[PDB]
Paper text:
The molecular target of diamide insecticides is the ryanodine receptor (RyR), a large ion channel expressed in the membranes of the sarcoplasmic and endoplasmic reticulum (SR and ER). RyRs govern the release of Ca2+ into the cytosol, driving multiple events, including muscle contraction. Diamide insecticides directly engage and activate insect RyRs, causing uncontrolled Ca2+ release, leading to tonic muscle contraction, paralysis, feeding cessation, and eventually, death of the insect. Therefore, we designed a series of insect-like chimeric RyRs that contain the diamide-binding pocket from Sf RyR and the remaining parts from rabbit RyR1 (rRyR1).
To determine whether these resistance mutations reduce binding affinity or cause structural changes that modulate channel gating, we recombinantly expressed and purified chiRyR-I4657M/G4819E and solved its cryo-EM structure at 3.6 Å resolution. The binding site was resolved at a local resolution of 3.2 Å. Additionally, G4819E introduces a net negative charge and alters the charge distribution of the pocket. The structures of chiRyR-I4657M/G4819E, regardless of the presence of CHL, all adopt a closed pore. This is unexpected because they were obtained in the presence of known RyR activators, including Ca2+, caffeine, ATP, and CaM1234, which typically result in a large proportion of open channels in the case of rRyR1. Thus, the exact identity of the residues in the pVSD, which contains the binding pocket, has a significant effect on channel gating. Our structure revealed that these mutations alter the local structure and polarity of the diamide-binding pocket, leading to the reduction in binding affinity.
Author numbering:
A (entry chain B): 4796 to 4941
B (entry chain C): 4215 to 4252, 4541 to 4587, 4626 to 5037
C (entry chain D): 4942 to 4989
D (entry chain D): 4167 to 4214
The structure:
Amino acid sequence: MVMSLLGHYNNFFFAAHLLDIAMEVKTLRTILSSVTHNGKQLVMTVGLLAVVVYLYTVVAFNFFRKFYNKSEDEDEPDMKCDDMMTCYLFHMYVGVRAGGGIGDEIEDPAGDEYELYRVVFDITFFFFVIVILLAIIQGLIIDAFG
Amino acid sequence: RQFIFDVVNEGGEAEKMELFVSFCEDTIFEMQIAAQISWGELEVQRVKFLNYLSRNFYTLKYLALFLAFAINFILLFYKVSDSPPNMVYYFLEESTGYMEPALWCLSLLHTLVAFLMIIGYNCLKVPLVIFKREKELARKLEFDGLYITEQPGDDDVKGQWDRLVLNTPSFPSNYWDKFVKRKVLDKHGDIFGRERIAELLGMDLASLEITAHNERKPDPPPGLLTWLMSIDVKYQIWKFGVIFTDNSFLYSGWYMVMSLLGHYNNFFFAAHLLDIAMEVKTLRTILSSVTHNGKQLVMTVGLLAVVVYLYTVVAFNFFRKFYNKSEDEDEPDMKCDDMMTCYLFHMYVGVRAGGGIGDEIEDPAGDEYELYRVVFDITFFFFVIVILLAIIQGLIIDAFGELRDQQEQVKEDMETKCFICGIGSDYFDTTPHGFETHTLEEHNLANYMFFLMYLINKDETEHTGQESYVWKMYQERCWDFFPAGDCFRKQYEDQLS
Amino acid sequence: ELRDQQEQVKEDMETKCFICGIGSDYFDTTPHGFETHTLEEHNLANYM
Amino acid sequence: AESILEYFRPYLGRIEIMGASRRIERIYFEISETNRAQWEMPQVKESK
Ligand SMILES: Nc1ncnc2c1ncn2[C@@H]1O[C@H](COP(=O)(O)OP(=O)(O)OP(=O)(O)O)[C@@H](O)[C@H]1O
Ligand SMILES: Nc1ncnc2c1ncn2[C@@H]1O[C@H](COP(=O)(O)OP(=O)(O)OP(=O)(O)O)[C@@H](O)[C@H]1O
Ligand SMILES: Cn1c(=O)c2c(ncn2C)n(C)c1=O
Ligand SMILES: [Ca+2]
Ligand SMILES: [Zn+2]
Ligand SMILES: [Zn+2]
């Protein structure tokens, strides 16, 4: 009721009912039931993420900050690690996203001086979040149907 | 609950009963400790103190977690500048001066409660981990002759480090049985060297002053200060070489040396955000599922390293003209002019991405080894991306099924059988609820344990007659009196139902 | 399927004999009997 | 005779064949040390 009366004020709020379908269609309830059933194990595993990328943020800020950049215009504008909490929001919008890792958004490290500290820092990141954590969030769904 | 869980889904099925008696004999020790927690100055104070911090054990734990989830958040306001208030790590607070100090007062606390976690563990849980080990030495000598007939393993570590305790005259300190040294002397005794086992189990003057304790009992002299020499230093080395092997007092050590270190860079206080996943009952389950299939995970990451080695040798011997790093001409930075330089293009820009060294190695439309490039790329894509990164999914997605199975055998074999006999839920359902009876008045775990504490309390001359039998058979260890297959209803089932 | 196939054996060679075909049940009317029926009576080795 | 009966424990085998009179009968016999010795070597055990 209070979505419809409100809709009488912007006529777009009438969109929320397209969202009851998934609350009828006997079949649709089953699928969604399977998702919601394993649901604390889903929220706390998204949790465990936030903290893993916090450890990668503290290691980036204390060592690697010269490798981050945002322009070709000279005079070094937009260095994305000059503050914590700015740095922690590069590691999620352009961090856990994509499909390769902060490795594709942070210059290249061929010219020695902390080189083999970058390749070891990227490979261990790729396995420990992309390959494992985005497989756990899938395993908790596939097992719920079983 | 934990004992019942790990005796149905491991190797019991015969010797489970002696484990149950072993289960009773250390809950016996645990209940005694709980009763005890519920210069005269020194004494009184020491005690009352060590006993507030050994009941409040779990609260102090969670508090550490809250205090570190705090200090970690106060760090997400550090900033860097080339001009000070070299680059300076000053604090960019929320305008108000109330953060630069509080971070200075929540560090010293994080290093006080850390000290209590160590002191506290050393009195709540250590006495039990000694009891569970001092018990084994007695039982592996009285009935096996481990240190009399043979040699322990000639290879193990916790079978010869304990050779350093038998000689001291304080061996039975916790195991109740303060005579685990005289009644081994008599069983082996004559067949072995009577005069030589009199000293290899310490306890000198045994062959001469055996019955010397016959006249009477003397009185000990009190005192102070000078009492600090009555330390059987040799026994202390042994126990202080056992507790440093327990997985617990070394996850408590690495809490302390992270905090003291944090007092040096204040960023090392980050490692506690990483204990969360070691509490939250739920989080342990998830991670347990990951670690359980863990050799099959390490060796499959292995099998990779070698597959990309065979691709590296084929690239270096044929295709090296297709690699490049610049548009500037004069051919700089050719990534295959050396091996080992080439093997580290195949992992940073190799197994990475989602298409394959095919997207980072020029194009091959101009003939001359063309259809040798397309066949080299497609077979690479299937043999590492589609298979090997599907196996590392499979070893995780399967482990939840195995761990949720193993947790549905118990809850279906402790509700369709007994645990002392072995009969079914069936037979006992010929009447109104009978299986709910057979395990509330007849057999019933608990009842059997509280016996073992009736017998001990009562004097010997008065044990009735059906007790002197089950107390002359717990001493020797010949467990046969448990029913294990027969029931009072089953035997007398006609004489009267 | 493969970790299944490896959990039929370890549960059918611990709930049956291998010469006769009787169960773990019957042979549990006394103190440990199934551990006896396959240590002195039937017992692979002995037959070889 | 708790010496003879104990010393000759790992030397007699008990079999439970059925034949002739359509009835179960027991068999006793003797096995040499070398006969049993060449049985616990790891190669044979994995074959089992
Ligand atoms: N002697 C016994 N034989 C078989 N099962 C028993 C016996 N004693 C207890 N149980 C099992 O324990 C349950 C009854 O006890 P209880 O309710 O305490 O178990 P629990 O639920 O695991 O423990 P709690 O109720 O304390 O959480 C029954 O399911 C029963 O099968
Ligand atoms: N005649 C038999 N009938 C049924 N099972 C038997 C027989 N003989 C041996 N077994 C099985 O083998 C096990 C006992 O022998 P043993 O311990 O040698 O098996 P194993 O553990 O596979 O081999 P090993 O102990 O040499 O590694 C029991 O689980 C039992 O079920
Ligand atoms: C004499 N005695 C005890 O005093 C004892 C015990 N189990 C624990 N205690 C304390 N047993 C089995 C025992 O025989
Ligand atoms: Ca009497
Ligand atoms: Zn019963
Ligand atoms: Zn049989």
